[PDB]
Design a protein around this ligand. Structure first.
Ligand SMILES: OC[C@H]1O[C@H](O[C@H]2[C@@H](O)[C@H](O)[C@@H](CO)O[C@@H]2O)[C@@H](O)[C@@H](O)[C@@H]1O
Length: 108
């Protein structure tokens, strides 16, 4: 269902504190800024990235968003260390079971 793309603009993601910042329009038509911490639903699992877990940037580096053919989407890729200590590249699409209300930001 709907995502924070068209509803919000100026998608920012700091790789240190992993916080997503973007301006969204409220029901009153007013524009406000919102922040979100993915670490809450993203953790490391034997070298892979999955939803439901937490604490991932601590064991991962080079996190960066990537725009596809249409700037209406950005994709999250990060290198996460494995339990043996090896480094591997994983990928994950934020667009999915996540959405933002007109004036509030909460999972759908
Ligand atoms: O911050 C603790 C860390 O613990 C768990 O991760 C394990 C493993 O996947 C990691 O590769 C190594 C460190 O490189 O540590 C543990 O053995 C996870 O619960 C992870 O989410 C958490 O951040």
């Amino acid at each position: 269902m709907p995502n924070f793309s068209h509803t919000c603009s100026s998608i920012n993601y700091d790789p240190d504190s992993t916080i997503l910042s973007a301006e969204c329009q409220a029901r009153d038509g007013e524009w406000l800024p919102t922040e979100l911490r993915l670490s809450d639903h993203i953790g490391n699992i034997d070298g892979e990235l999955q939803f439901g877990d937490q604490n991932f940037q601590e064991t991962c580096q080079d996190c960066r968003l990537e725009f596809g053919d249409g700037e209406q989407s950005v994709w999250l890729v990060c290198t996460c260390q494995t339990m043996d200590g090896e480094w591997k590249s994983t990928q994950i699409l934020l667009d999915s079971q996540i959405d933002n209300n007109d004036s509030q930001l909460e999972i759908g």
